[PDB]
């Protein structure tokens with residue numbers, strides 16, 4: 001009858017009468033996640049259900065991502081777990097509820113997301129990815145706008161549910177690798193995905209234009225110059241250089257996170273006051289659900 005949620009440094013007793021079911025979070029690839037209000041605090045949280053009867057694989061992956069989240073309590077850029085509740089037949093996982101993902105913001109904006117926002121997102125996501133690798137040995141392997149979450153507090157956090165570690169975002173060196181079935185590669189492939197994601201969000205346009213097939217996209221990644229930010233949109237020199245470095249085609253010359261964290265783009269966005277919160281709220285208030 002009773003579980004526990006820890007939020008804001010405080011542990012709370014929670015019975016079902018304490019939780020208001022506010023419905024689906026939206027069109028996921030996951031399912032069985034609800035937005036719920038915790039009546040004792042007014043926090044709205046996300047609750048994911050893992051059925052004991054569910055697919056072994058899907059469940060093993062959930063548990064692995066959960067393991068990482070539980071050990072990531074010291075990272076501001078990873079979505080936090082508030083609690084778990086195990087019944088005979090299910091496990092419920094309470095998570096910090098974010099507003100939406102960058103993929104959906106792009107759709108709402110019907111175009112470019114401002115540099116200022118993308119700068120703050122870059123700082124957060126690089127730090128999240130770096131944290132994952134350095135603390136937990138996790139190489140994300142799926143950095144894309146759908147895994148970048150924002151909220152109306154102005155927080156920016158990474159996602160993976162997959163955090164335990166998509167041809168469009170594939171680095172060159174990963175396209176026809178020496179050993180694809182024994183895929184022991186490094187974080188530079190994720191750096192490339194980040195650069196793609198930034199160009200896509202900065203332009204409003206996924207950079208591999210009018211490709212009809214996944215293979216055709218891969219041909220573009222290999223044959224074409226990196227899809228650098230355009231020169232005609234008022235992008236800063238630091239943002240353009242940051243994206244160019246991320247999109248270094250030769251992976252041996254592409255920077256790692258520790259080097260990216262020194263980039264002027266990051267240094268400037270660490271210090272720049274940007275009201276991501278108000279901006280997100282305006283967007284969500286003026287646009288419709290994709």
Ligand SMILES: *CCC(=O)N1CCC[C@@H](n2nc(-c3ccc(Oc4ccccc4)cc3)c3c(N)ncnc32)C1
Pocket residue numbers: 025026027028029033046047048061062063065066069079093095096097098099100101102103104145146147149161
């Ligand atoms: C572009 C983003 C998007 O479309 N979606 C689909 C709808 C849900 C949204 N989203 N997911 C979470 C979330 C992920 C995972 C869990 O629980 C969990 C799974 C495995 C291992 C540990 C925990 C719960 C929620 C979101 C959260 N927290 N907030 C907002 N949107 C979220 C992704």
Ligand SMILES: C=CC(=O)N1CCC[C@@H](n2nc(-c3ccc(Oc4ccccc4)cc3)c3c(N)ncnc32)C1
Pocket residue numbers: 003004005014016019020021034036047049082083084085087092093094
């Ligand atoms: C109100 C919605 C409701 O009932 N629902 C909709 C969702 C699927 C079903 N569900 N949900 C729970 C449950 C369990 C825990 C929890 O919060 C936590 C509290 C502490 C730690 C972690 C999570 C919230 C809801 C649940 C349950 N207990 N038993 C059966 N079906 C359940 C039916």
